[PDB]
Scaffold this active site. Structure first.
Site, mmCIF file in Angstrom:
data_model
loop_
_atom_site.group_PDB
_atom_site.id
_atom_site.type_symbol
_atom_site.label_atom_id
_atom_site.label_comp_id
_atom_site.label_asym_id
_atom_site.label_seq_id
_atom_site.Cartn_x
_atom_site.Cartn_y
_atom_site.Cartn_z
ATOM 1 N N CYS H 47 7.838 -0.960 -37.960
ATOM 2 C CA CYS H 47 8.507 -0.197 -36.949
ATOM 3 C C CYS H 47 9.956 0.026 -37.335
ATOM 4 C CB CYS H 47 8.431 -1.002 -35.638
ATOM 5 S SG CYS H 47 6.819 -0.832 -34.817
ATOM 6 N N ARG H 119 0.822 2.500 -30.341
ATOM 7 C CA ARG H 119 1.150 3.172 -31.598
ATOM 8 C C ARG H 119 0.913 4.654 -31.264
ATOM 9 N NH1 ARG H 119 2.511 3.068 -37.035
ATOM 10 N NH2 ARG H 119 4.366 2.029 -36.149
#
Lengths: 238, 238, 238, 239, 238, 238, 238, 238
Positions: H47, H119
């Protein structure tokens, strides 16, 4: 599914051997209390002894402004025949209406419904409110002098704003005294004790003697009558 | 939503100021009748006068095989404190248990529930069957002697196979006579009338006098006690 | 919610003034047809004339192997009093049972049920099967001879395997002839016509005269009795 | 789930071989009673006998102000062929409608109904469209049509004279051709009656008088006499 | 709510003027196809024509091993009367069963149901499988030789393993040729196109002419018969 | 849930290779009938043969005031490629729209639906009412000349108020006679037999020849053409 | 209604222009990954360009153990025609199967389903687990070299036990390095930090370079191909 | 239930680390596209690399008129220390908001929701419509230059009214070309073909090159950046 004490008598139309009427409206309209009393079947010995006993106390009930109405699970034709039989073999005329409740609608609505279970006394006041109910079974006749004590006592209660002790007018603790409804707040309890106006055992147990001499004696009379063996039986000259 | 007369007393565990117990079982296992009576709350006067009246007639219930049990919507700790107050202030000891019913579980289960509606006397026989119920409002004391007449006539009825007429043993028609249960077939009614074995007013109204003078006179003693002015109130002698 | 013709008589237990019985079993296990007839209430005039008419035809039903059972929405105690009244006043004993059906349980279950809707005759054969049902209003008495004519004819059609013409044994087309139940295939319908064994109007209308002279005379006897004015009314010498 | 005596005949529009009609309305409108009678199927022998029997009493039905209407579970086209067959082979014209109930709608609505054998049932309905009597003969048993005439005459008399009618009337064992006064239902009503002195009486609840004109009484007695009598001359011989 | 093409014909017992039979079973048991054809009512003119049309072509159907069965909303009795009349007035005997569908249960079950909507032809194969359904309204009679064409083309398809082009045996593109079901894979398609065993317009469109000259002349006979005005009408020689 | 004959055709929007349209409205607006005909998928042989058959008869349909519309379960892009293939390889151009029904939404609303089940011709009149449905299975091409006969016949019975016999105009009983709809009352049947206006076999079977000789011969040319072996197949022509 | 990353691919039978197969089993059985990519309809230009792009990358996909499968809302026959067209007009044969999903069952089941929403690529590993899903709209063709980068990077992840940074193998922080999946406990973090065995930005951000030089240059090669202006457009050489 | 392409972005109020904004309104109001990308938790390395790649491209997105917004299942306070750690240790300030979605309320509404499942990329246009969604798993970093290619192509497709071929601007067929949305009727198909206004492979595949040379190179620039190995990694300048 039986009504509760403090509830208005269920609204209903009923057929009696005196005609169609609406309960409790029919008595409320005349400012009357009524005692509705129930029986499983016409031509039955125990219930016959109750109709006769209520009949003999008829003036006592009118004197208190109380009407009587019976209920039996049999047609209006049997009710008439049964009543005729009573006046003919017993020599006592039954002046109050009987509800004709075959099908047992009224009983079922009242929560009494077998049929053996169709017993039950409703004492209803002039506002339509169920005030007392007694359920003696079919093999035990009612003590009708107690019903009279009950309405006489409820009436003195309402009018004098008093609760009534066990066995009034012969309460073992306070006699024919009537109980002042208890305080529900602490300032109220205190003010009552400082007030010094009532006979007292505690702030929750004050009483006085506001029933008149006649009322008290009217109420001992009922109980003397329950208590004495009758001079003269009706089977003797029937 | 009450139990009907004729039904078993609802199975239940309850907590009383004498300990935890199952009803009806705890009295059934002793072959004992019980009179279960209810109250809206502790430290109320009409109820106190009732406990006291029950407590005074306690040997009269023992003699009959009847155990007494109270019900109030208040904790065991209130019940014990309420009792001590009665012993201390009125000099009468209350010997029977009271069910601690805070939360009103038992009351709701019996149909009684408010709390003002929490009243009612269940008279239950040694098989745990409800034989009579009485609902007096919170403002009217019970006539405890009529509870005595009731169980005594009902045990009388049971052991003699007889019904009991209004006002017994002072019935206006047959006095202290007791009613033979009416025939239900034509053959059975024919045969009754051929036997000439009872006093009769019709095939459906036969009677006789099978109760002993001990039985009759014990039942009139209760009505008599009910009718007598007390000599010496408890509040004076307290 | 009434039974249809062709279905079993509903399984049920019932109390009559002769005692508890199971229907239709009680009759079925005897090889008896029975006729059950219904009435709104005891001590009603039309129904009384019906009981009487049934009572007067008692032996006629016995001879056909038919039992009679009545139904009225009143208690067994009323039933028996109404019965005695009839015998005492009209001078006819009612030999058959009457179902004591207060609460109208039996009537509800047979779709009869307010109260006046409790009328209706079921004619049930010795296998328990509802064969015919008549619904006369309470203001109109039944033609009891027509009931005899129905079972005689049904017993005949059953034993001889024939259908029975309108107005039999007096049918305007074929008189006391009985109909062969029609063919349902074309094969059958051709076989029947080439056989030349029946009088015929069409393959679907064939009949013969298989009933004895005794059976036919018996059935005219019912209808003649229905037709003739009685010499001697029962009301006079009463 | 039959209608009940004392209930109004179910509102319905039906197709008959005389056309489409609303019941009870068509008859009510004319102040007529009707007798509706029912049949499993056309071209069946037991029904043909009742049809003919009704046809022969057709003028007796008009004197009482009663219309007749059949029902059968078959199309209108069969109803017509069936009729023509009866008229041709038995020489009796069928003058009343028959409702065509193919599919069973009307029969189901009256609750008569692979059954159909159960489609039987006579509804005698008065001029206020109220069901007054119903009879359920099985398919294997013709109806006694004179008894239907008896019931309507008796029911029209009870109404006009305010009387109940005794078993077997006009040949009741107890009171012959007398008619019953509806019983009293109150204590005062019952005493008042027995004070009036004005009926023949067996008890407060069993009173009667004899107010039916002698033509009324004899008319109801022919019905029964006809039912009882052997026909001179059958119809199958004649044909 | 109609069964769809390819679905098994609904299992069911039906009553015909030939007796009770089971569908599709009764036909499957014999290796026969059937054509169920329905009508709104007996003694109607369109249906009468259609019945007569099927009867005249009855051999053609037997030779293909196809039974016929009618369905109409009327009783077995009516059906048999309708058939006698056709035989009497038209001179044609109707040799197949007609289903009596009073109540319309069968028609309701096949989604046909009012009553006018009770039309509809079901073409059912020897495996019990619905293969074709046609719905002409009641005012339009069927073209009965197209039904012969239909089963004859389906039987050829089944057995030659072929699909049948529009208008066969007179299709504009391929004449009396018959279609190879199209490949459903790239490998199947390539392989076919390399097999060069068929005449071809594309891989999905191959055919040949494998039906006999007899089979083709039989199908043509049915169309020719459809197209020709009959010398002699049946109303004439009646 | 396929629509019934007699119902207004389900109101809907659909997409076709000629654009979006509303059914039935798009055709009701123009006082036109339409024939909707369904097919499992594009590039299929039997369906191609049917597109072509409809296309060569297109003038006949125009002549009757009938528009044509396909439905196939594939996208509009495939429809158009499929039509180009047909015109390029068969040399016949397809003039009518085809509904793109990917998802099968339209087939599903019409009860056709897998997909092999997506067959079915609806003949819808100019007021939007479904007049006839045919369900040929996907391995059998339709006979398009019968679809022409049906709409010519329906239109003639509409304008003339008659029904059309079996096989019309070659019916075996009455040729090109047309049926007067049967009377539905005894009265109407009597008046009609009296009138002498129709040729007749029974009161419910009455007929005349009111169609013009042109209309008769027009309906017979459809069938003649279906019966004719084509000169010149298109597979060779190509 | 779409399945999510980490779930097993929905079990299903589907029809492809290569024949009938079971997903995912058909690929699981072979230890093969598959890529499934959907399309709203056949003969549509964006999807054509995508099929051609996949086809060209076919050997690239196969070397990774990836089979390809299409899905389009059209029939198998349209699919085969569409592919014929692509090989004929573009000169590229399409080797992977395509699911015929007329009705849209398969797409509805995958949550893709208008039809314009029938897009979307599922990357499914050899265990049948959805690993990645991409939803490009109908007007925007996929970058197919990104699909190749995803399955490559995913396969290195799985086998090397390693997470892959953004823009791998060209990440701005760590270039071709791979991330060690973060420690999830305090102990495990200290330990990872004490071991000094990884390059490291923090205890949650550790990485190494365990991928082969062929592996890295293979992934760069897909991206170099994505970036490069093609030599020879296929429409020119068409 | 994830939303689908072409649905409006769900209307909602979210807390970010720049404050409380309403989506998609906050961006619609500015006429800006937005890209929303989700992350399972803060302080996770894949991330973090994705944030860094987004911030490096932040001015590339601004020139297209695209705002960036992140989503993670942690608190505002944790996001802010995450951004601080990224700036401090990586030397890159992260300029865009991150929605604090603890509880996973926003992720659930969006269909992402375990937790690893959170996600996903939503590309949303200036009308607030979802145009593309991408679902890479937690262990696979996004290729952010491909998100730029997507919006640029998409914005170009909208402005020029053209679809975009696979791999644009390097499509193997048509290179930099864009595709004319296909004709959907037969008339537009022919009109387009006869008009000669487009390079063409078939009626459904028509293209031109309206992209400006600057658009094309911008789009290749993204792809070239995605393919170049960085010289200077950010971990080694720390």
């Amino acid at each position: 599914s039986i009504p509760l004490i403090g509830e208005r008598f269920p609204e209903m139309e009923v057929t009696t051997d005196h005609g169609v009427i609406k309960l409790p409206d029919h008595y409320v309209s005349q400012g009357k209390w009524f005692v509705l009393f129930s029986h499983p079947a016409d031509f039955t010995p125990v219930c016959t002894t109750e109709f006769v006993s209520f009949a003999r106390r008829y003036e006592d009930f009118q004197r208190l402004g109380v009407d009587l109405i019976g209920l039996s699970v049999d047609s209006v034709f049997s009710h008439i025949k049964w009543k005729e039989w009573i006046e003919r073999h017993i020599g006592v005329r039954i002046p109050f209406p009987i509800i004709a409740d075959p099908q047992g609608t009224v009983a079922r609505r009242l929560g009494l419904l077998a049929t053996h279970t169709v017993r039950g006394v409703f004492i209803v006041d002039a506002r339509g409110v169920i005030r007392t109910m007694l359920y003696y079974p079919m093999e035990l006749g009612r003590l009708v002098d107690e019903i009279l004590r009950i309405v006489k006592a409820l009436k003195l209660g309402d009018s004098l704003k008093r609760a009534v002790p066990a066995d009034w007018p012969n309460n073992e603790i306070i006699g024919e005294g009537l109980i002042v409804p208890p305080p529900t707040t602490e300032d109220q309890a205190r003010a009552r004790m400082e007030s010094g106006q009532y006979r007292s055992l505690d702030w929750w147990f004050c009483w006085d003697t506001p029933a008149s001499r006649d009322d008290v004696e009217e109420a001992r009379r009922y109980l003397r009558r329950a208590a004495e063996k009758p001079a003269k039986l009706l089977y003797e000259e029937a």
